[PDB]
Amino acid sequence: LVYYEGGAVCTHARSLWRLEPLRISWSGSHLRWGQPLRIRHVTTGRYLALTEDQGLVVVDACKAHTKATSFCFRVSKEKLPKRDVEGMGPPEIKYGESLCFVQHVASGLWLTYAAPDPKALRLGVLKKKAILHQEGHMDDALFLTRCQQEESQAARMIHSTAGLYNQFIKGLDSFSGKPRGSGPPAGPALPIEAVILSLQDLIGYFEPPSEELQHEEKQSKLRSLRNRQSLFQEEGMLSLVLNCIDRLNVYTTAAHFAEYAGEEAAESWKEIVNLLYELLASLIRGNRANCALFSTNLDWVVSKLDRLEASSGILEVLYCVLIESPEVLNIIQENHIKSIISLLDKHGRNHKVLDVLCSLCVCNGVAVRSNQDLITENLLPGRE
Amino acid sequence: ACFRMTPLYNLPTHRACNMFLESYKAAWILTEDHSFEDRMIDDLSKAGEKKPDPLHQLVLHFSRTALTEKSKLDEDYLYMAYADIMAKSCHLVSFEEKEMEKQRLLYQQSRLHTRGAAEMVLQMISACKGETGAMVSSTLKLGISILNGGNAEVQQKMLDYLKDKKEVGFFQSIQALMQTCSVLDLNAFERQNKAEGLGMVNEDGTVIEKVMADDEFTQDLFRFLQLLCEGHNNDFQNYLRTQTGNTTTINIIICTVDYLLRLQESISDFYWYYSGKDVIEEQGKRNFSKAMSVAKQVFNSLTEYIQGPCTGNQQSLAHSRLWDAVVGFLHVFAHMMMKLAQDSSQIELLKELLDLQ
Amino acid sequence: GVEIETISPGDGRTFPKKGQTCVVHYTGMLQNGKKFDSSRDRNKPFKFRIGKQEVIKGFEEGAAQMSLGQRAKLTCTPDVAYGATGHPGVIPPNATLIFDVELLNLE
Amino acid sequence: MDILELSERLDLQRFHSHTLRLYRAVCALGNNRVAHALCSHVDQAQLLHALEDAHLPGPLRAGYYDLLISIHLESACRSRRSMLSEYIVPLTPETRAITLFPPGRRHGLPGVGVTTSLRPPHHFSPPCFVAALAPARLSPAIPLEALRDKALRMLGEAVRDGGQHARDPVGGSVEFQFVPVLKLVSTLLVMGIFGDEDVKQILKMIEPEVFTEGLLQMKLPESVKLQMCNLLEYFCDQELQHRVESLAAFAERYVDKLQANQRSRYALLMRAFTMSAAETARRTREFRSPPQEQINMLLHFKDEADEEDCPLPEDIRQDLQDFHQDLLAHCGIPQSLQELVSHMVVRWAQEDYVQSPELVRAMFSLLHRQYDGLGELLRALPRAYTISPSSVEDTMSLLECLGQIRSLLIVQMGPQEENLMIQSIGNIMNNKVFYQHPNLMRALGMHETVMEVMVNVLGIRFPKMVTSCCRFLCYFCRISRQNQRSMFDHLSYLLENSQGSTPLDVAAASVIDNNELALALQEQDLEKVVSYLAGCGLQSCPMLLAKGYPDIGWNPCGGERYLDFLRFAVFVNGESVEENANVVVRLLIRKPECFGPALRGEGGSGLLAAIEEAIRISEDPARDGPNRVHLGHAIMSFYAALIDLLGRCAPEMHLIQAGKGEALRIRAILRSLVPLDDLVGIISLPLQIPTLGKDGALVQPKMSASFVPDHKASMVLFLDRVYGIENQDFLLHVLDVGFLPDMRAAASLDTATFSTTEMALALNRYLCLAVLPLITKCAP
């Protein structure tokens, strides 16, 4: 469902659109008003379309049949279309300012906002629903703004990553029960290698800037990194990683994953789990918002503190969340601190656990008194 | 109070000591003059055995304070003092005499120019993010001191940095400041003065908030803008109404005209509220005086924008509604002075109004 | 209750009483062997007056049985000790305390 | 294993270093209750031994030094630091003998001299764990004498031979050798422990040439540079304190003399005011001038062009001039600290590029202070109050309470902290100092510290904190006008955040009978207060009906609560602020629902009906519930305060003859607003009578249960304030039921048996305040 939303989505990834002519050659020519072009949402791979069910929905790729998805571009509302040219084309439309309408080619349906009076506008954000209209409001005009290369690259990466990981999740559910025993696990083969390579590429994509780098580019790079993490968050990549981790950690070890999905797949279960945890760490490391996003499911990470498969990764995730959010300190309870302490007596003498405990007490220069107490009365007196 | 008030004799020593100590301060310590900025900048400049000079290190630190991401810049008294030190360093009949003063000023501004003052000034201006704080009151003064006399090297460096950095916020911040600039506001003029009329100066009561406090601020911002243009650096005035490299584009000159229109409205309303009355109180007198002073500054700014033949700025004005403002000023001006001509005590006020026109 | 293990014999004629101030250099320990507090490390003797319950009841009774100049070793069971709560951060719950005390002077 | 073995067993080294870090973390920021536990685990012995051990590795040497500071010191260090930046100076006889330059004019050593600035002591508590089993646990004690001399001795052991150029460092690096010891010494200095001889040793060590191949001369890394920056900063602060105290001492002597000539001159005039009538009769003035102006005129001789202002003898003003020259000399206007700091800082800057930002900041802060001393004196003088010698212990109580208060803003607020702040506030109030010296509490930033606490809590849980804080702020308002103004600035916050007592009460108290502040009311603030009434015009608090309640549409509860603020904001000092009048009714009509469920417009109903609602549905308790409050009487309060606010917003009669079309149209708005007649209705809508007889019962109605007589009084006020009474007919009409029968009820209550009742008293006030004065007005 399309909406003329505003505010945040002026700087998010679902707001992007990608123009595409219906001519394969010279597609990059300058836009001429009324060339039968085709618009493709990038982060979802859907096409602005004219269907009978709703009038304006983003149909999937497989039904952009040159009628529902062909559009012109019109300077003004009046009636009248130029055949494409084998050259770069004399420029007509301009970024920034030059206004242009939207004109479907099938049924002359111009694109105006419905603007009815339901409770959706009053309760939620002012999101004027977008619909087609033969004429509609006479003030349905558009300013064209360019997107930076990092934004477009991140949008396409979101598209590919979401598709691949949803396929992987689909497979994981395809053998939810069903112990294969002897023989094949199921029909589809897990995109194991694609998952691993994509994970490593994304991990590279989010690496922090080098400390040794100067102070005038490191902050620009930090801003870019925070922005990219924000884009990936606001399109569900955190949720996709969380769901993959949930689907995998159900299996207590690689052997269980083999019993359900064959040995040839289980040979990399540990690696995939470690990569998933490290990616989830990178998505949140430093970004205040994404660390805040773990206010509720904190128990989640705590409940998984004692998995010997990927132990360092989950600890480092917890460390990042704790040091980049004060609110998650207030929600800490006794069972959480007890689990963190038990991590010491189960996995040995490791200093990072102590560092996590230190971060639990003081935040932003303010001391969380209850955490100090709980740590003192649950760790020190035993002296073991 | 008219019936009796204390001799200091009956005050116990504890109150008397305080009242002494808040009078010895203003009467004596404030009036004292210490000229240390020159020596501070003269010795911080020397580096005597690629290594940046000490003043350069200070400048880079203050720049870092701005480049680092902080939503609202926090009051740093250190910058708020060193900036004024630098400004005082920059600040201080024959053609040879004039040229000697000119050379001294050139060196004084250039020593800060080399070590990175222009960049930090612009960065801090951006960092204030449209807020009216003493931060800007100091940064603008420092920038003016650097640019006083139109040191073309400074204009080159600032334009170059603002171009290559392609920052889209500097002009947004300047626009925010400018649209937040005050205006004579005859309203509060009636209010408080009437209140003052009542005169609630009771026991230990204090007569004194001048209307439009932030007159010096506007007068300095507009002067800064003008000095950015002085010397007819047509390239800079060309960049002014259109960045052409930034993601967006803002015309600063039209915003300047907008503030001019606001001031035109305010003085016009002053004219009507005061029109019936014959002699304005001294408070209203210097209210109008400081109004014309800010006006003189804004008009010199406008002049500068188009002083050279920046035809682009000329057309931008040619569409602008400045015509009305001055049209208003026409009706605003000739009426004033006739009444001002009627007042013999307001001759100097008439002089100021005349030179404004 | 408390017990008196005469590590070294004191005087045996004089004993602490009501309204008198006793000074001690106590070094103390848990039952396993860990040590929690020692006056001797602090370097100052500890003072208290038999009667107003400065200390846990057990310590008071134990120091009351003692003589002057007699080192001993009290063994305060939890009930005459801190007890179920335990001193938070120092004494675990329901712990038995052993105290190498030495009644130095009785004033 | 021996601890020094943690120099090759690196994993245990790191683990133990982080264990010490965790110890400091749990004890951080005032947690003394945990500090005692750490005393048990790390003793007062181990600490001293680790401090005096050379073979210990770095991450453990620094670890143990910082552990010592955390367990024992940095809970009195932060508090003593917070109160270091203020300069209360008791006018003791001791403080009189303080001269900038010790007699003999060369600088005395910094920080070596009698300083009477009134810093409070810091309390400790022995740590024993045998005591029987909350009040604030003080920090664990430590012998602060062996520690002091020990720090000095090891600093000496680490300085010159430190520069022996030996590749023997104490702890693996020059940094790990110096940094901890300097940290400890600076902390001890700030605590005020070091005597004068010890301070002389410290100075001799820092720079032996000027203070009498030192410390600054030798080779140095950056962190150690930062530590010397802290030390020299402490000494600069001591010098500033000395200047301020010398100003206080000279103020004392010079004012004890400066009064003498005033009395002598008064005697001279009284003996000789005659013979010079209208000649000295102008000079006799300045004795009826207010005292601050008198003092300013007394101290007005420096410019030598204004010298006629001063009537002083020449010698007396010479005293001030000499003191001024001495002050300038002391302020600089090497062979001294100033030049040492300047040359040191410049040399550090010009011998290497400093990559430590905080080091750069420290360097240039010191440099600025050492080039401008007069300026820092002028910026510290605002914090300078000379209290009498008597009121000194009270100030200690005040300062310790303030220390606890501002020592809890660093800790998130639980129940224990809540109780501690509430006790501290009460202790602040009870000081007679709080009454006597309001300027001081404005100087210490008290109304800002408490405001900050309230902002933190409001930004709800812990409501009693907001109640206590707002009561404190109301008292601050009431104490004196300058406080009112002070907090009037925050009125935006104090209003946008709006239970017994409320921050809205603070906002109202800011402007109670202060024309200057009342007028200065920004319009948008008036909207903000009409919003939150617009914000409560059509609503019922879910926070009210959590128990069985009739759940009516509108909520007068918040309504009247906001209304009273406006009532204060419009009418002051027995007259209207007509300047802030059009704003009031204009803003009220822009939200034409605010006039109540009745008097909206279309759908509006009878005002007599508007109250008839309560007349019936309030008096039966069948609707309220199956005890906090009752209804109707609060509804009546709403429909009372509305009318009172509008009445107060009425133009005065002399302003009526001003022909103010503004005022006249406001009258018209009022007149169309409520009919001129309904008045007599609500005036005549009768209310119950006390339990006269009734078998000696108490069926006398509860006020919260029966009709607001002040509702009718407000009616009368509005009646005589805008509608007025102009014929004997309407006066007769009101007297018929609205006035005379009320008098019958009152004088029936006049019986000694049924006069003490609250209802009689309220009716007495009602008749006295509005009825009787009106009747007097219409008598001719």
Residue of A nearest to B67 (CA): A216
d(CA B339, CA D455): 53
Q: Is C97 on the interface with A (CB under 8 A)?
A: no
Can you list the positions of beta strands (E) in D220-282? Answer: none
Give me D702's structure tokens. 């509860």
Q: Are D503 and D466 in contact (CB under 8 A)?
A: yes
User: In the annotation, is C26 catalytic?
Assistant: yes
Pairing state between β C27-30 and C97-100: antiparallel
3-state SS of chain A is CCECCCHHHHHCCCCCEEEEECCCCCCCCCCCCCCCEEEEECCCCCEEECCCCCCCEEECHHHCCCCCCEEEEECCCCCCCCCCCCCCCCCCCCCCCCCEEEEECCCCCEEEECCCCCHHHHHCCCCCEEEEECCCCCCCCECCCCCCHHHHHHHHHHHHHHHHHHHHHHHHHHCCCCCCCCCCCCCCCCCHHHHHHHHHHHHHHCCCCCCCCCHHHHHHHHHHHHHHHHHHHCCCHHHHHHHHHHHHHCCCCHHHHHHHHCHHHHCCHHHHHHHHHHHHHHHHCCCHHHHHCCCCCHHHHHHCCCCCCCHHHHHHHHHHHHHCCCHHHHCCCHHHHHHHHHHHHHHCCCHHHHHHHHHHHEECCEECHHHHHHHHHHHCCCCC
- CB–CB of C22/D130 below 8 Å? no
Q: Give yes or no: C82 in active site.
A: yes
Assigned token pair, D355? 């990559």
The encoded tokens of residue D341 equal: 């700091």
Question: How many CB pairs below 8 A link A and C?
Answer: 15
Three-state SS for B265?
A: helix
- Where b means 16+ CB within 10 Å and e means fewer, A266-294 reads bebbebbbbbbbbbbbbbbbebeebbebb
Residue from the list B69, B248, B249 with its beta carbon closest to the beta carbon of A219: B69
> Which chain C positions have a beta carbon within 8 Å of D127's beta carbon?
42
C91 is catalytic: no
Q: Is D25 on the interface with A (CB under 8 A)?
A: yes
Q: For B186-207, give the DSSP string.
A: HHHHHHHHHHHHH----TT---
**Euclidean distance between CA atoms B168 and D578, whole angstroms:** 48
Structure tokens at B87: 């400004």
Q: Which among A351, A357, A375 has the least Cβ separation from residue D14?
A: A351
Residue with the two structure tokens 């014929």: D727
Q: Whole-angstrom Cα distance, residue D68 to residue D81? A: 18
Number of CB atoms found within 10 A of residue A66's CB: 11
Contact criterion met (CB below 8 Å) for B256 and B226 = no
Question: From CA D342, how far away is CA D335, in angstroms rounded?
Answer: 12
Q: Is C99 a catalytic residue?
A: yes
Helix (H) / strand (E) containing D488:
helix D481-488
Compute the C-alpha angle D178/D183/D185, nearest 5°.
95
Give me the residues of B, 144-183, that contact D with CB < 8 A. none
Q: How many Å apart are CA D697 and CA D690, to the nearest integer?
A: 10
Hey, is the C-beta of D133 within 8 angstroms of any chain C C-beta? yes
Q: Rounded CA gap, D714 and D729, in Å?
A: 21
- Using CB atoms, which residue from A354, A362, A383 is nearest to D28? A362
C56 classed as catalytic: yes
Give the side-chain half-sphere CA count within 13 A for B117: 30
**Listed resolution, Å:** 4.0
What is the maximum alpha-carbon separation in chain D? 111
Token pair 């917070």: residue: D82
CB pair distance less than 8 Å for A381 and C92? yes
For residues D301 and B27, is the Cβ–Cβ distance under 8 A? no
Distance of CA A358 to the CA centre of its chain: 32
- Give me the residues paired with residue A49 across strands: A57
Q: What is the CB neighbour count within 10 angstroms for residue D694?
A: 11
* Chain D CB contacts of B11 below 8 Å: 259, 291
Quote the CA–CA distance of A354 and B157 in Å, as a whole number.
Answer: 51
Which of A353, A358, A377, A379 is the best substitution to test chain D (most D C-beta atoms within 10 A)? A358
Q: What residues are paired with A101 via a beta bridge?
A: A74
- Which residues does chain A have within 8 Å of residue B248's beta carbon, measured at their own beta carbons? 96
Rg of the Cα trace of chain C?
13
* D325, containing H or E segment: helix D314-330
- Residue B357 structure tokens: 């026109």
Chain A, nearest residue to C33 by Cα: A383
Cα angle D303, D309, D310 (rounded to 5 degrees) comes to 85
Angstrom distance (rounded) from CA B157 to CA B114: 10
Residue by residue, DSSP assigns D708-764 as -HHHHHHHHHHIIIII---SHHHHHHIIIIIIHHHHHHHHHTTSTTSSSSHHHHHHH
Distance from CA of A215 to the nearest CA of B (A): 8
Give the closest of D41, D45, D132 to C56, CB-based. D132
Write out the two tokens for A22: 């219906």
Q: Is D134 on the interface with C (CB under 8 A)?
A: no
Tokens 């309060």 belong to: D637
Residue-wise DSSP of D4-53: GGTTT-HHHHHHHHHHHHHHHHHH-TT-HHHHHHHHHHS-HHHHHHHHT-
Angle at which helices D196-206 and D174-190 pack, to 10 degrees? 150
Size of interface A-D (CB pairs under 8 A): 64
Name the binding residues of B for Ca(2+): 230, 304
Closest CA to D715 of D568, D611, D583: D611
Active site residue C36: yes
- Give the C window 24-83 contacts with A, CB below 8 Å: 34
Vertex C94, ends C89 and C96: CA angle to 5°? 95
Closest by alpha carbon to B234, among B298, B314, B168?
B314
- Binding site, annotated residues of B: 230, 304
Which residues are CB-contacts of D247 (< 8 A; sequence separation ≥ 6)?
B21, B24, D327, D377, D381, D384
Sheet holding C97-100: strands in order across? C35-38, C27-30, C97-100, C74-76
The three-class DSSP label of residue D622 is coil
Query: Helix D607-617 to helix D633-648 angle, to the nearest 10 degrees?
Result: 150
Residue A307, Cβ density class (10 Å: 0-12 exposed, 13-18 middle, ≥19 buried): middle
From A351, A369, A373, residue closest to D18, measured CB to CB: A351
Cβ contact D224:D216 at 8 Å:
no
B69 contacts A223? CB cut-off 8 A = yes
With beta carbons under 8 A apart, name residues in chain A contacting D31. 367, 369, 372
Distances (CA, A) of D18 to A324, A358, C90, D24, D50: 20, 9, 20, 10, 16
The answer to whether chain C touches chain A by having 3 or more C-beta pairs less than 8 angstroms apart is yes
**Considering only CB atoms, which chain D residues are within 8 Å of A354?**
15, 18-19, 21-22
- Which chains form contacts with chain B, at 3 or more CB pairs under 8 Å? A, D
Q: How far apart are CA A134 and CA B141, in angstroms?
A: 59
Please answer whether residues A15 and A44 qualify as being in contact, where contact means their C-beta atoms are separated by less than 8 angstroms.
Answer: no
Breaks (C-N over 2.5 A) in chain D follow: 104, 133, 212, 333, 459, 498, 626
Question: What residue in A sits closest to C36 (Cα-Cα)?
Answer: A381
Amino acid present at D577: V
Contact D288 B36 (CB under 8 A): no
Q: How many C-beta neighbours within 10 Å does residue D753 have? A: 13
- Cα-atom radius of gyration of chain A, to the nearest Å? 26
Contacting residues for B148 by C-beta, under 8 A, at least 6 apart: B90, B91, B105, B109, B227
Q: Shortest CB distance from D410 goes to which of A349, A351, A367?
A: A367
CB contact under 8 A, A383 and D26: no
Cβ distance C55 to D37 less than 8 Å, yes or no, reads no
Residue in D with minimal Cα distance to A367: D411
Residues sharing a CB contact under 8 Å with residue B81, sequence separation 6 or more, in sequence order? D368, D372
Interhelix angle B311-319/B282-307, nearest 10 degrees: 130
Q: Which of B68, B248, B249 sits opposite A219 (nearest CB)?
A: B68
Gyration radius from chain D CA atoms: 36
Q: Do chains B and C touch (3 or more CB pairs under 8 A)?
A: no
Q: Cβ of D99: how many Cβ atoms within 10 Å?
A: 17
CB-based touch D/C (3+ pairs, under 8 A): yes
Residue D508 structure tokens: 């109202």
Q: Do C89 and A377 touch (CB under 8 A)?
A: yes
C-beta atoms of D130 and C46 within 8 A: yes
Q: Alpha carbon C96 to chain centroid distance?
A: 13
HSE toward the beta carbon, residue D773, CA cutoff 13 A: 12
Select the residue from B14, B42, B273 to test the D interface by mutation, using most D Cβ atoms within 10 A.
Answer: B14
- Tokens linked to C9: 């014999």
Q: Which residues pair with C29 in a beta bridge?
A: C35, C98
Within 8 A by CB and 6+ apart from B125, the residues are B136, B139, B140, B143, B170, B173, B174
Token pair of D480 as six digits: 């004196």
The per-residue b/e assignment along D449-461, b for 16 or more CB within 10 angstroms, e otherwise, is bbbebbeebeeee
Closest CA to B147 of B304, B335, B319, B7: B304
**Angstroms from D566 CA to nearest CA on chain C:** 54
Cβ neighbours around B96 below 10 Å, total: 8
Please name the residues in contact with A255: beta carbons below 8 A apart, sequence gap of 6 or more. A266
Chain D residues whose beta carbon lies within 8 Å of the beta carbon of residue B78: 361, 364-365, 368
Contact, D633 vs D679, CB < 8 A? no
Which method, experimentally, gave rise to this model? cryo-EM
- Smallest Cα–Cα separation from C88: which of D36, D419, A383? D36
C-beta atoms of C34 and A373 within 8 A: no
- Which among D226, D199, D205 has a CA at the least distance from the CA of D159? D205
Closest CA to A138 of A112, A164, A120: A112
Distance of alpha carbon D190 from alpha carbon D261, whole angstroms:
43
The residue of A216, A225, A227 whose CB has the most chain B CBs within 10 angstroms, and thus the best one to mutate to test that interface, is A216
E strands, D497-600, in order? 571-572, 575-576
Output the CA–CA distances (angstroms, integers) from residue D640 to A349, D31, D551, in the order listed: 72, 52, 21
Q: Which residues of C touch D (CB under 8 A)?
A: 26, 28, 36-39, 41-44, 46, 53-57, 59, 82, 85, 87-91, 99
